Short mmCIF file of C-alpha atoms and ligand atoms in Angstrom, two decimals:
data_model
loop_
_atom_site.label_atom_id
_atom_site.label_comp_id
_atom_site.label_asym_id
_atom_site.label_seq_id
_atom_site.Cartn_x
_atom_site.Cartn_y
_atom_site.Cartn_z
CA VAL A 1 0.00 0.00 0.00
CA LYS A 2 1.31 3.51 -1.07
CA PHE A 3 -1.95 5.60 -0.91
CA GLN A 4 -4.44 6.21 1.90
CA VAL A 5 -8.00 7.64 2.14
CA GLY A 6 -8.09 11.33 1.20
CA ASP A 7 -4.88 11.25 -0.90
CA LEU A 8 -5.16 13.19 -4.16
CA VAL A 9 -4.16 11.16 -7.21
CA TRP A 10 -4.37 11.20 -11.01
CA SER A 11 -6.01 8.01 -12.47
CA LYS A 12 -5.85 6.76 -16.09
CA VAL A 13 -9.04 4.75 -16.69
CA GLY A 14 -10.56 3.31 -19.88
CA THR A 15 -10.67 5.83 -22.73
CA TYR A 16 -10.32 8.88 -20.46
CA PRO A 17 -7.25 11.10 -20.02
CA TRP A 18 -5.30 11.26 -16.71
CA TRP A 19 -7.97 12.50 -14.31
CA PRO A 20 -7.92 14.18 -10.88
CA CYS A 21 -9.21 11.90 -8.10
CA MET A 22 -9.39 11.37 -4.36
CA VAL A 23 -8.63 7.95 -2.81
CA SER A 24 -11.63 6.72 -0.75
CA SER A 25 -13.03 3.62 0.94
CA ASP A 26 -15.37 1.50 -1.25
CA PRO A 27 -18.92 1.95 0.23
CA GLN A 28 -19.55 -1.85 0.15
CA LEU A 29 -16.09 -3.43 0.71
CA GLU A 30 -15.12 -0.74 3.30
CA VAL A 31 -11.51 -0.79 2.00
CA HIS A 32 -9.62 1.82 -0.13
CA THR A 33 -7.20 -0.77 -1.56
CA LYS A 34 -7.39 -4.46 -2.54
CA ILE A 35 -5.67 -7.24 -4.43
CA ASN A 36 -7.69 -7.99 -7.60
CA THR A 37 -8.58 -11.37 -9.23
CA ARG A 38 -5.32 -11.16 -11.27
CA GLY A 39 -3.29 -10.68 -8.05
CA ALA A 40 -2.49 -6.98 -8.64
CA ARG A 41 -3.05 -4.05 -6.23
CA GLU A 42 -5.91 -1.63 -6.96
CA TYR A 43 -7.04 1.62 -5.28
CA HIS A 44 -10.60 2.89 -4.89
CA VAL A 45 -10.97 6.43 -6.20
CA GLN A 46 -13.55 9.18 -6.58
CA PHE A 47 -13.26 11.21 -9.82
CA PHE A 48 -13.44 14.98 -9.31
CA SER A 49 -16.15 16.12 -11.77
CA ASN A 50 -19.67 17.62 -12.09
CA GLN A 51 -20.67 13.90 -12.53
CA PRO A 52 -19.73 11.98 -9.30
CA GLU A 53 -18.35 8.49 -10.08
CA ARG A 54 -15.98 6.02 -8.47
CA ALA A 55 -13.73 3.18 -9.65
CA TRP A 56 -11.23 0.53 -8.68
CA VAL A 57 -7.94 1.39 -10.45
CA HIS A 58 -4.78 -0.73 -11.00
CA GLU A 59 -1.84 0.78 -8.99
CA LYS A 60 0.16 1.25 -12.28
CA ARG A 61 -2.63 3.66 -13.44
CA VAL A 62 -2.52 5.86 -10.28
CA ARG A 63 -0.05 8.74 -9.61
CA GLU A 64 0.29 11.24 -6.76
CA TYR A 65 -1.49 14.53 -7.64
CA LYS A 66 1.04 17.36 -7.00
CA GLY A 67 -0.87 19.98 -9.05
CA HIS A 68 -2.69 20.49 -12.37
CA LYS A 69 0.56 21.47 -14.22
CA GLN A 70 1.79 17.86 -13.69
CA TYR A 71 -0.52 16.80 -16.61
CA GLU A 72 2.32 17.47 -19.16
CA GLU A 73 4.68 15.10 -17.20
CA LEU A 74 2.08 12.32 -17.29
CA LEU A 75 1.80 12.61 -21.11
CA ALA A 76 5.64 12.45 -21.22
CA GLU A 77 5.58 8.97 -19.48
CA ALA A 78 4.09 7.42 -22.68
CA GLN A 79 7.56 15.39 -34.16
CA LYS A 80 5.67 15.35 -30.86
CA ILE A 81 2.31 13.62 -31.12
CA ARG A 82 -0.65 14.84 -29.05
CA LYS A 83 -4.17 13.46 -28.84
CA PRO A 84 -6.79 16.23 -29.31
CA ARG A 85 -9.02 17.12 -26.37
CA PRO A 86 -12.83 16.64 -26.97
CA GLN A 87 -14.95 19.66 -25.76
CA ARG A 88 -17.50 18.09 -23.31
CA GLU A 89 -14.72 15.91 -21.81
CA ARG A 90 -12.34 18.94 -21.48
CA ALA A 91 -15.16 20.91 -19.71
CA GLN A 92 -15.69 18.09 -17.10
CA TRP A 93 -11.85 17.77 -16.71
CA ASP A 94 -11.54 21.55 -16.09
CA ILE A 95 -14.31 21.24 -13.41
CA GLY A 96 -12.49 18.28 -11.84
CA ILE A 97 -9.18 20.19 -11.84
CA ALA A 98 -10.83 23.22 -10.18
CA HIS A 99 -12.04 20.92 -7.34
CA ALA A 100 -8.67 19.14 -7.09
CA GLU A 101 -6.84 22.51 -6.84
CA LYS A 102 -9.23 23.53 -4.01
CA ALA A 103 -8.66 20.07 -2.32
CA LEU A 104 -4.86 20.45 -2.59
CA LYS A 105 -5.18 23.58 -0.31
CA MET A 106 -6.99 21.51 2.39
CA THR A 107 -5.58 19.01 4.89
CA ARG A 108 -6.33 15.27 4.31
CA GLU A 109 -9.05 15.38 7.10
CA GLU A 110 -10.62 18.52 5.51
CA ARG A 111 -10.66 16.87 2.02
CA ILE A 112 -12.28 13.72 3.49
CA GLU A 113 -15.07 15.83 5.05
CA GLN A 114 -15.59 18.07 1.98
CA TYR A 115 -15.51 15.44 -0.77
CA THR A 116 -16.35 11.90 0.41
CA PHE A 117 -19.43 10.81 -1.53
CA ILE A 118 -22.77 9.90 0.01
CA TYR A 119 -24.03 6.60 -1.46
CA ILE A 120 -27.77 5.88 -1.69
CA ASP A 121 -28.93 2.33 -2.48
CA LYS A 122 -31.38 1.90 -5.40
CA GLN A 123 -34.79 1.40 -3.70
C1 EH8 B 1 -12.17 9.78 -15.88
N1 EH8 B 1 -13.15 8.69 -15.80
C2 EH8 B 1 -12.89 7.37 -15.97
N2 EH8 B 1 -13.95 6.62 -15.82
C3 EH8 B 1 -15.01 7.49 -15.54
C4 EH8 B 1 -16.36 6.94 -15.32
C5 EH8 B 1 -16.57 5.87 -14.45
C6 EH8 B 1 -17.84 5.35 -14.26
C7 EH8 B 1 -18.92 5.91 -14.92
C8 EH8 B 1 -18.73 6.97 -15.78
C9 EH8 B 1 -17.46 7.49 -15.99
C10 EH8 B 1 -14.56 8.79 -15.55
C11 EH8 B 1 -15.26 10.06 -15.28
C12 EH8 B 1 -16.08 10.20 -14.16
C13 EH8 B 1 -16.72 11.41 -13.95
N3 EH8 B 1 -16.58 12.47 -14.75
C14 EH8 B 1 -15.81 12.32 -15.84
C15 EH8 B 1 -15.13 11.15 -16.14
#
């Protein structure tokens, strides 16, 4: 384990770009980290966005979030070739970054209080 609840991280999931997240405890498993069915470590994250969502992410797809300007360094990990940025997606990413920049100014306990999602079971 390298991340704990309330840590700010970037996650690279599915078809999405590196995205600002907060590590959190899964509402059902009550753990923020686990070993998956392939034997690899995963972390439970919340995506910062206008659309609240969560996911289990392979440790190789998680990075410490030091600030929004780190995005360039993450693209460097992979003429220069750049993927274009789709409009709706860029708008949600900018919202997520604005929240992550606000969260970076808080303590870990403050972030946990401000951002941990409330989960409501389908009735
Ligand atoms: C970056 N990202 C990777 N997966 C998701 C996602 C997960 C489950 C359902 C839907 C999307 C998102 C995302 C989440 C919220 N806002 C923007 C992107």
